[PDB]
C-alpha cells in the first residue's frame with residue numbers, strides 16, 4: 001500500500017499526492033538564509049517527493065532553487081515532485097488570484113504548481129502587508145465572497161497553471177459553500193488543517209472522506225510551539241506517555257509514531273524540519289505499522305483542543321473554528 005518508493009494516494013481530480021511531504025514554514029527572524037533550500041534538497045535526497053510551501057513564508061525562491069537543482073542533476077523529473085502553494089488572505093479579490101499564482105510560479109521559476117490552496121477562508125485588506133491592522137491594532141477585514149475567489153482559482157487550473165485545487169482551514173459549512181456552488185467546475189480535492197493525535201479531526205475527516213476530499217495534516221508533529229501562534233501552556237504532543245511508550249515498542253520516536261498514525265488512516269502529513277537528522281527520521285515511517293488496537297489507543301488521545309486556534313481572528317465573519325467542525 002505505502003512504501004518509501006511508492007506512497008502516493010489518489011485525488012478526486014485524477015491526480016495523486018505523496019502521503020508525506022516536507023513543510024517549509026520557518027520564522028524568518030530566526031532562520032538562516034539558505035536553510036530552506038538545503039532542507040528541501042536533503043528531503044528530496046531522502047525520498048520526499050512532496051513539498052508544502054507558501055509565498056508568505058518568504059522562502060519560496062529557496063524552495064524553487066532546491067527543486068530546480070534536483071531536477072537539473074537528474075535526481076527527479078518535474079512530474080515526480082509535488083509542490084503545494086497557498087493564496088493568502090490579502091489576495092482573495094478574484095482579479096488578484098491569477099496574478100498572485102503567477103508571482104509564485106515566477107519565484108519558483110516553474111511552469112505550474114501541483115496544488116494551490118486558499119490558505120484561510122478569511123479575506124483581509126489587500127496591500128503590501130499580510131497582516132493589515134490600523135493604529136489601534138484592529139484587524140482590517142475585507143468583506144469577501146469565497147465562491148468568487150474559487151471561480152478565479154478554477155480559471156488558474158483551466159489555464160494549466162496548477163494541477164489541483166484545494167483549501168485550508170475550512171470548516172464543513174465553508175466546504176459546503178464551494179461544493180454547492182452554482183456551476184461548480186472543479187471541486188476542492190484537499191483540505192489542509194491541523195491534525196495529530198491530540199486533535200484528530202474525526203468529524204471533519206468523516207465529512208471530507210464522504211466528499212472525496214483528502215485531509216492534509218499541518219502541524220502533524222504538534223507545531224514548533226511558538227507562543228505567538230501556540231498555547232505553550234498545553235502539554236507538548238511529542239512528550240505524550242503513550243506515543244513514547246509505543247515508540248519504545250517499535251524502536252521509533254514519538255514523532256515517527258505520530259506520523260505513522262496519520263498516514264495509516266490515509267491522512268497526508270507535512271512535518272517541517274530543517275534539521276538533517278530529523279528530516280531523515282520523519283521519513284522512516286514505512287517500515288512498520290500500528291495494530292488496530294494501537295490505532296484505537298492513539299485516536300483516543302484526541303483532546304478536541306487545537307494548538308493553532310488563531311484567536312486574533314476569532315471575530316472575523318469567516319473564522320473557521322467557532323463551529324463544531
Ligand SMILES: NC(=O)c1ccc[n+]([C@@H]2O[C@H](COP(=O)([O-])OP(=O)(O)OC[C@H]3O[C@@H](n4cnc5c(N)ncnc54)[C@H](OP(=O)(O)O)[C@@H]3O)[C@@H](O)[C@H]2O)c1
Nearest residue numbers: 023024025218219220221222223224255271272273274275
Ligand atoms: N495551512 C496552514 O494554515 C498551515 C499552518 C501551519 C503549518 N502549515 C504547514 O505545515 C507544516 C508543518 O507544520 P509546523 O511547521 O507548524 O509544525 P510541525 O511540522 O508539526 O513540527 C515542526 C517543529 O517540529 C520540530 N521537529 C521536526 N521533526 C521533529 C522530530 N522528528 N522530532 C522532534 N522535533 C521535530 C521542528 O524543528 P526542526 O526544524 O529544528 O527539526 C519544528 O520546530 C508547516 O511547515 C507548513 O508547511 C500550514
Ligand SMILES: [Cl-]
Nearest residue numbers: 055086087088
Ligand atoms: Cl499569497
